[PDB]
Amino acid sequence: DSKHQCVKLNDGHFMPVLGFGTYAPPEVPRSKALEVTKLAIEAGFRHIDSAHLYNNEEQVGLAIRSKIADGSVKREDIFYTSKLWSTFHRPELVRPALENSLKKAQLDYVDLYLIHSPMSLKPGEELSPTDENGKVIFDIVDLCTTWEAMEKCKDAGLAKSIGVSNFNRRQLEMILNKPGLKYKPVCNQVECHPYFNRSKLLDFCKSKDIVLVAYSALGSQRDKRWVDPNSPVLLEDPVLCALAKKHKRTPALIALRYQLQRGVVVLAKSYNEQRIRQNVQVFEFQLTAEDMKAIDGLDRNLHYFNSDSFASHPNYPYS
Ligand SMILES: NC(=O)c1ccc[n+]([C@@H]2O[C@H](COP(=O)([O-])OP(=O)(O)OC[C@H]3O[C@@H](n4cnc5c(N)ncnc54)[C@H](OP(=O)(O)O)[C@@H]3O)[C@@H](O)[C@H]2O)c1
Ligand SMILES: CC[C@@H](C(=O)O)c1ccc(-c2ccc(C)c(F)c2)c(C(F)(F)F)c1
């Protein structure tokens, strides 16, 4: 089926080009992640994006287990992604972090394990370690050694594929130029949308056989902790809205289809049954070449996540 279209990764594995985003803010009860991940699988999502940080791998794993038990899907039909959180970058912490995620989700392996971010944080139990003055505490880790620990996780069969997230070109090149590299990252999961389309990074990744995976492809959830309320709302963009009317679709569907036609694997978060099912209709239509150029013109270099807690980190990927 067209809905189960995949891209071949540089390690031979396959990744579905449309993925379900599972992050919800901590004020959303965890029971919802369980309910909506089941809804996503029912609608035809097979790529599910989670992370230790999201405090939901148990619920996402329960949803997968439930849909396997009622015969909707086999484990082999699901592409499950987890992410190493930034307090676990030190190489001796990597494999135990992955094994803990597997235990929470009650899975035997992940299809994809990512370094969540290059911005290392102080090791410990707290996900957001902070000093007496409230500032998040940074750590300094050679991410090449983190990657070597990820490579051992793939060789152990705990992760079918490994990749990175929120890396810029310089940080990617550091991994790719590493002496004795065994596995290249299969992907780089980054913020990517018509207001921040990452064409330069996309061209770099294409030249290296690295898939760019787009998050916040619908403009982010605009969480007040990190998103400026005065930033423009992506789905209210006049060009996207006119394209939605011309195609008799929605602005969200235009934004998702834009990514598929430029070779980007796209994530979409929804906790609403009707929008979850609408988002799978991205395979039903096509943007013209002129439509694509129009959307290409919307780039504003706008990353919705903006905070001096990020920007002061030595490994902050933007500039
Ligand atoms: N690697 C990283 O650092 C990183 C960072 C950010 C995100 N991610 C991952 O990418 C996923 C998606 O990114 P995101 O969380 O920023 O959200 P997003 O995909 O950009 O979606 C933002 C909002 O769009 C709404 N939406 C979904 N479908 C819609 C539709 N058809 N029409 C209108 N609105 C629609 C959703 O609200 P409703 O729920 O109300 O439908 C959602 O809250 C995340 O959940 C996470 O899995 C990863
Ligand atoms: C809270 C949602 C969560 C998710 O859904 O993954 C998320 C969202 C954005 C970022 C983020 C922000 C700024 C910069 C520069 C970055 F590189 C990554 C992170 C990260 F990586 F910092 F943890 C995590």
Curated annotation (Swiss-Prot):
Tissue: Expressed in many tissues including adrenal gland, brain, kidney, liver, lung, mammary gland, placenta, small intestine, colon, spleen, prostate and testis. High expression in prostate and mammary gland. In the prostate, higher levels in epithelial cells than in stromal cells. In the brain, expressed in medulla, spinal cord, frontotemporal lobes, thalamus, subthalamic nuclei and amygdala. Weaker expression in the hippocampus, substantia nigra and caudate.
Activity regulation remarks: Strongly inhibited by nonsteroidal anti-inflammatory drugs (NSAID) including flufenamic acid and indomethacin. Also inhibited by the flavinoid, rutin, and by selective serotonin inhibitors (SSRIs). The oxidation reaction is inhibited by low micromolar concentrations of NADPH.
Protein EC: 1.1.1.-, 1.1.1.210, 1.1.1.53, 1.1.1.62
A GO MF label: testosterone 17-beta-dehydrogenase (NADP+) activity
Active site location: Y54
Reported function: Cytosolic aldo-keto reductase that catalyzes the NADH and NADPH-dependent reduction of ketosteroids to hydroxysteroids. Acts as a NAD(P)(H)-dependent 3-, 17- and 20-ketosteroid reductase on the steroid nucleus and side chain and regulates the metabolism of androgens, estrogens and progesterone. Displays the ability to catalyze both oxidation and reduction in vitro, but most probably acts as a reductase in vivo since the oxidase activity measured in vitro is inhibited by physiological concentration of NADPH.
Protein name: Aldo-keto reductase family 1 member C3
